[model samples]
Target chain A: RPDFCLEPPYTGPCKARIIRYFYNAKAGLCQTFVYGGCRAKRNNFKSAEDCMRTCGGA
Target chain B: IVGGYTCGANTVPYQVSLNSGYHFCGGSLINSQWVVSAAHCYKSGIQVRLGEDNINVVEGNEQFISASKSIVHPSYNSNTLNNDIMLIKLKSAASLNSRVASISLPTSCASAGTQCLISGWGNTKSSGTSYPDVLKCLKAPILSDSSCKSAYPGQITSNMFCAGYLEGGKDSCQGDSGGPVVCSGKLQGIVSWGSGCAQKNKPGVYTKVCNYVSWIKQTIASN
Candidate 1:
């Protein structure tokens, strides 16, 4: 008998919209300082531009 | 509309009228063919009326306009209310007159210390009863973009603007959502949400109309 791989197979769509929507919906519920309400006030970046840059590439 | 005040606290004055039967949500006449309000207030079973002081008794018949279409920002999510804004298209163009006219959207820069007025039928007190038959107005200073950034940290995005006392208590409430936050006679922002109605440390949040001007204009033009 040949060696059998036991890894789970991929079963989801590979479309960008689906992935983006999935991520956006998940990000919406997270308590991150960028998505929902602010948790920390001080020591945080002052401008939204800077925050966006720091939090980008998500 | 008098002085530089293009939009004022509005109320319907007829008990028998269809609009008079329901609550008055805040709205601004953007143009002869359009009015702007919050997406939360634009759901099914909503109606728009103009020109009256009292919802129980007054002169001048209310102009009832059906919302032919409501375009909610696709990005708007009820959970967080991000980009929670919308435009209401009146079935017929509102005739501009003494009683009916458009409020000018803010085109100038706004900073901290900017005095603005919020008007609506929200609760008069935090966790209090919603005002009936009358529209109420409250005044607050605009929090600097930097200060709002500091105060709200990650939550205060470019799309969100803050205005109110840090101590709170004098902020807009539930029914106030989707109302106007007027400054210098310009429609600067639309009421969105906050931690609570007039809660300490939680100022009222508004959708920055200036940031969404292009989107609004494009939507209106396309429609």
Candidate 2:
């Protein structure tokens, strides 16, 4: 029910904009999620392929 | 499809018969030059014949090609059959025709209860000895992962899914390895490993193609 953005400036919705991210090893890629607008780390991304390109470049 | 009868020759254009010196397994054309199949299907060297409906016939429309290269999933586990997927690059790209073409890959994973089409020349009965000359197809509903897990126990993995009847009726058998499991007009699975042929409460296990899409793209780019 929360809003989020993978890219910087958080353009989705400021009300619920807290992004979370994690890597799914089975899929061999990274994914993003919504958080409680609290703390964040360098693990997030602006797009789906951002992480794959950075860490799992084709 | 399992328990199916003889049908039209031009039905499955993307279907190919893998020839490991002989008729070995079935595979699907993902593009003009790439064939998607099970890694375990390869025992020796591999070749492929596109647009082949009959195994023994040298049809005019058949496009037999030698494999220039082959890539099996690096994590493929022969024991548990995990990551039972592979790609074959044809020595020469098949010229697309009415009798030879490629199937579309899925954008996402398949869901439970989806009815998918399976085609091959596998055994029709568990006690059968030989495969049919013509291709056969059947529509089998996908079993829920939980339901599938119950039947397979520790054998099932994230790389696999299940499809067949729970009542011990129909399934893809011995000679159907590396065949395509098409659902909703897209190739979603690959014939991998299973317990047996059409056993009660046990369905055929297949390698989930969606889960390997990224890996497929990576390999295709380099190869």
- Candidate 1, DockQ score (0 to 1): 0.02
Residue A5, candidate 1: alpha-carbon lDDT: 13
Estimated TM-score for each candidate:
0.69, 0.77
Candidates' chain A TM-scores: 0.24, 0.43
lDDT of 1 by residue, B1-223 (tens): 1111112334211111113235535677788878887765554545677664454555474576777888988897665566878888878876666666677776775777889877765557565444445566677888877877776667777777888888766877655566677788888888776766566676777888887788888999999
What is the clash count of model 1? 3
Candidate 2 local Cα displacement, residue B37, angstroms: 0.4
At residue B40, give the lDDT of candidate 2: 71
Candidate 2 chain B lowest-lDDT run of ten: B122-131
For candidate 2, the iRMS in Å is 22.7
* TM-score values for chain B across all models: 0.84, 0.96
Candidate 1: what lDDT? 0.59
Q: Model 2 reaches what TM-score against the true structure?
A: 0.77
